[PDB]
Design a protein around this ligand. Structure first.
Ligand SMILES: Cc1ncc(CNC(=O)c2cnc(CNS(=O)(=O)c3ccc(F)c(F)c3)c(C)n2)s1
Ligand SMILES: Cc1cc(C)c2c(O)cc(C(=O)O)nc2c1
Ligand SMILES: N[C@@H](CCC(=O)O)C(=O)O
Lengths: 276, 262
């Protein structure tokens, strides 16, 4: 068969979820269909599949890959977790959707790290990223490896910095800096928007998150006050597949082909542009 | 059971300097008081020479992580590897022919090479920058986008940058101005910028951030990464990538950047 089950996750500007036009019930312009499982109530786990519309940098990467590798897909949004975390030796999120054979591949802002590579096959990285630090203008740290982060109480007053948990960033801090990590838990931010609001209002001195999203958020900050510093643990976004799928060889060739065709900057020239 | 490692002269990734009179290599030190670890690398007459730098340090750490023995030699023809009925030269040809079991060099990952060999996960991420003695925003700056003879810019002729600039249609009018100003080598263009006959030099960022120590301008464009080169039948190459991912995350690649590039 050639119909592929592909999972994704909303994170602008790489995967944006828009509501479907009531009628026409079609995804318009630069859009593909993507279904999201939404529960009816909290009493039971019964729900429905809301077919919506998805666009973004990674979506265009999906369309061109579907065009060059020649395949069809049933794109859907993960509703059990997010990017992927191993909870009690059981992976969830997009990574879990691939490990347990509910999705043959995952496209989105999926960070390539070592621990995920031991259970899924990542493609060639197509978006460079890592762990960056976002602060307001004037705040002075050198990066994640700064000793104001490793030893927060060594400075007065202690810095106030946090991250969005369960992702690759909080995971990396957890194994590299056990003290810094369990100090950040006090300042954990539920979302990326909640994080930057806390920075501008002055309750957070720094925001440690994915470099690709921060560089985009720093690009469109109101008044250009939130800035990134300087990338630690440099890596990239990768299309994850199951261990040993036939498509991994073809996708690496198609992704690498888009580089030689000027198609990769063609999309960054479109989605990742910044005013600041 | 030694690994035949092939590399190429490309600072700051791989420095090569002659041996002393006794056949050894002078013991130098980093900016930090750490000693510089060097390996003997035969190559062009074929005499033993001294290799050290980014890739060498990466080779030493890779050689200890998965525990293998290695013999480093510079590539004979001194090329990286191109498709010239078609056959590879440089380190690409030496890997596929069998003269090398693994390539540890600043080798760009691209589509044509991946159809024959297979890279590891990128141990180094970079792109292209501009080298001027002056402000430039990058590839989208109006002074390169709308070329004039008031601001001259080019690259090395037939280089990896020139080959790609011609390849793109969107850069036609921009590239035509460069084609009339391209130089033979990199050292000629960097001297042209210094002697005020070339106003901008598009080249690899690591080579130009290093040469400035002239200042780089604007954000990087046309990103490209380097991976460990092996044949697709290599049993080790799985953990070769896992070690590259491991060294990125534990901060080892940062220490390499602080020691050589910054
Ligand atoms: C915020 C953004 N960063 C990058 C964007 C667009 N992507 C590219 O330009 C690009 C460049 N090269 C390659 C293949 N070689 S590589 O070693 O794997 C590599 C090198 C540098 C990279 F930056 C990267 F992602 C991957 C690929 C597949 N894509 S957007
Ligand atoms: C660090 C560096 C610098 C230059 C100037 C390179 C180049 O011309 C070609 C190639 C290549 O095709 O691998 N790689 C390079 C790597
Ligand atoms: N991009 C991350 C999620 C956000 C973060 O932790 O920086 C991942 O895929 O794991």
């Amino acid at each position: 068969d050639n119909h592929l089950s592909i999972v994704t996750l909303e994170e602008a500007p790489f995967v944006i979820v828009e509501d479907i036009d009531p009628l026409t019930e079609t995804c318009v312009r630069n859009t593909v269909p993507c279904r999201k499982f939404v529960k009816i109530n909290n009493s039971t786990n019964e729900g429905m599949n809301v077919k919506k519309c998805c666009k973004g940098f990674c979506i265009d990467i999906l369309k061109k890959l579907s065009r060059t590798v020649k395949f069809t897909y049933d794109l859907y949004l993960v509703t059990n977790g997010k990017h992927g975390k191993k909870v009690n030796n059981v992976w969830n999120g997009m990574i879990g959707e691939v490990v347990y054979q509910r999705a043959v591949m995952a496209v989105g802002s999926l960070t390539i790290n070592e621990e995920r590579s031991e259970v899924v096959d990542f493609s060639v990285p197509f978006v460079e990223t890592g762990i960056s630090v976002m602060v307001s203008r004037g705040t002075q740290v050198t990066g994640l490896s700064d000793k104001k982060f490793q030893r927060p109480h060594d400075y007065s007053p202690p810095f106030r910095f946090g991250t969005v948990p369960n992702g690759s960033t909080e995971r990396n801090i957890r194994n590299n800096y056990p003290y810094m990590h369990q100090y950040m838990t006090r300042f954990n931010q539920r979302g990326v928007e909640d994080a930057l609001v806390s920075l501008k209002t002055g309750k957070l001195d720094a925001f440690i998150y994915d470099a690709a999203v921060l560089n985009y958020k720093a690009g469109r900050d109101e008044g250009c006050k939130l800035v990134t510093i300087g990338i630690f643990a440099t890596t990239g976004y990768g299309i994850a597949l199951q261990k040993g799928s036939p498509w991994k060889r073809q996708i690496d060739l198609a992704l690498l082909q888009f580089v030689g065709d000027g198609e990769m900057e063609e999309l960054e020239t479109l989605w990742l542009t910044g005013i600041c | 059971t030694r690994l035949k490692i092939v590399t190429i002269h490309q600072e700051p990734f791989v420095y090569v300097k002659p041996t002393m009179s006794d056949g050894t290599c002078k013991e130098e030190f980093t900016v930090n008081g750490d000693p510089v670890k060097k390996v003997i690398c035969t190559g062009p007459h074929t005499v033993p020479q001294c290799c050290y730098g980014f890739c060498i340090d990466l080779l030493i750490k890779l050689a200890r992580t998965m525990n293998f023995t290695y013999e480093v030699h510079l590539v004979a023809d001194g090329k990286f590897g191109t498709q010239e009925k078609k056959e590879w030269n440089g380190m690409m040809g030496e890997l596929l022919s069998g003269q090398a079991d693994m390539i540890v060099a600043p080798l760009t990952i691209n589509n044509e090479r991946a159809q024959y060999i297979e890279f590891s996960k990128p141990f180094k991420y970079q792109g292209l920058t501009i080298l001027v003695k002056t402000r430039i925003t990058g590839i989208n700056d109006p002074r390169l986008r709308n070329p004039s003879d008031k601001f001259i810019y080019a690259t090395v002729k037939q280089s990896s940058v020139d080959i790609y600039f011609r390849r793109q249609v969107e850069l036609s009018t921009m590239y035509r101005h460069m084609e009339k100003h391209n130089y033979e080598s990199a050292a000629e263009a960097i001297q042209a910028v210094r002697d005020n006959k070339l106003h901008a030099f598009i080249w690899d960022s690591a080579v130009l951030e290093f040469e400035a120590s002239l200042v780089t301008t604007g954000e990087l464009f046309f990103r490209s990464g380097f991976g460990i080169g092996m044949r697709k039948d290599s049993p080790w190459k799985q953990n070769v990538s896992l070690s590259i991912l491991k060294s990125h995350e534990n901060g080892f690649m940062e220490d390499l950047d602080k020691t050589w590039v910054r």
